[PDB]
Structure formats: structure tokens, C-alpha cells
Design a protein around this ligand. Structure first.
Ligand code: HEM
Length: 154
């Protein structure tokens, strides 16, 4: 699939807002993911023991993980589709080391959309959300293809 320049502009416009507070968006997104799909928390051995949202909000390890997720995703989005190089090591670690099914990438994609919708209603209208969804679908499609080449595709 291919996004138009206009769609990339909508994506990068709201992303510039996200970058004003990377750590805060990172926390919100991961907490949303864990509350909606608790099974996903089990993959993070470092903080798999957190029981409540209050504990999650207080965790420095979870905040750092959120910053890591957003910084990596931001680098990918700014490539505007020319992200083959950035995707290789990411697909390898998530398929082979962490063992993250595509299903979970769909779950985090939904958490990202929910948080942007909550925090940036003025810059995340229907057209902007459609463009962000398309960009994340492109990301998931290319990652799924790499998973298969690596012997996982789970
Ligand atoms: C947009 C989605 C994602 C991005 C861009 C991303 C990015 C990263 C990055 C850059 C790291 C650091 C080095 C490495 O590759 O190991 C990492 C680690 C990890 N990721 Fe992801 N990730 C994503 C989604 C997920 C999901 C959905 C899960 C689990 C449900 C997950 C679980 C992990 C785990 C377990 C680690 C290592 C934690 C640690 O450092 O101890 N990732 N991810």
C-alpha cells in the first residue's frame, strides 16, 4: 500500500504534537494497551508484576519503555514509507527474542489511535485518524512480511 503526501502530512502534523511530550504519551499508550489487553503485559518481564494503573503510572521502567516505543515508531513514520532499514532489527527482535504476535501490534495500534483521539481532538479529526490508521496498517503489513522471512509470522 501507499499513502499520499497529503496523508503523510496529516500523520506528521499530529505526531509533532505527540513529540512535545514523548514520555507522557508513551505512558498513556502503554497503560491503555495493558488495561484493554492485560495479556500483553506478560511480555514485559521487567514490570509484568504491576497490578494497578496507579502502580503503572508510578513505574519508571514502564515510562522508559513507552519512550522507546514512540521514539522508534516516530523514526519509522518520518521515513514516509521508506522504512525497510529501520524495520529489519525491529522485526528480528520482536519475532525472535520477545515473540510478539501481529495480533499484539494491532492492539497497540488501537491504543495509539485512542490516545491521540483523547489528547488531540482538534488535530485528530476523521481524515487525520484515517491517515494514521493507514500508516499503522502499512507498518503492520511490512512487519508481518518480515516476520515470515524470519521464520515466525506469528
Ligand atoms: C509500534 C510498536 C512497537 C515498537 C515500535 C517497538 C519498539 C521496541 C524497541 C525499539 C525496543 C528496544 C530494542 C528491541 O528491539 O528489543 C522494544 C523492546 C521490547 N518490545 Fe517492543 N515495540 C513495539 C511493540 C511491542 C509490543 C506490542 C510488545 C508487547 C506486547 C512489545 C514488547 C517488547 C518487549 C518485551 C521488549 C523488550 C523490553 C525490555 O527492554 O526489557 N513491543 N520494542
Amino acid at each position: 500500500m501507499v499513502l499520499s503526501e497529503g496523508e503523510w502530512q496529516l500523520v506528521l502534523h499530529v505526531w509533532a504534537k505527540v513529540e512535545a511530550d514523548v514520555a507522557g504519551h508513551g505512558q498513556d499508550i502503554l497503560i491503555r494497551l495493558f488495561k484493554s489487553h492485560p495479556e500483553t503485559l506478560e511480555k514485559f518481564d521487567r514490570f509484568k508484576h504491576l497490578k494497578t494503573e496507579a502502580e503503572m503510572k508510578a513505574s519508571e521502567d514502564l515510562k522508559k519503555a513507552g519512550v522507546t516505543v514512540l521514539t522508534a515508531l516516530g523514526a519509522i513514520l518520518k521515513k514516509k514509507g521508506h522504512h525497510e532499514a529501520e524495520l529489519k532489527p525491529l522485526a528480528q527482535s520482536h519475532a525472535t527474542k520477545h515473540k510478539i504476535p501481529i495480533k499484539y501490534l494491532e492492539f497497540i495500534s488501537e491504543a495509539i489511535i485512542h490516545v491521540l483521539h483523547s489528547r488531540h481532538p482538534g488535530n485528530f479529526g476523521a481524515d487525520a485518524q484515517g491517515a494514521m490508521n493507514k500508516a499503522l496498517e502499512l507498518f503492520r503489513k511490512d512487519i508481518a512480511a518480515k516476520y515470515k522471512e524470519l521464520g515466525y509470522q506469528g
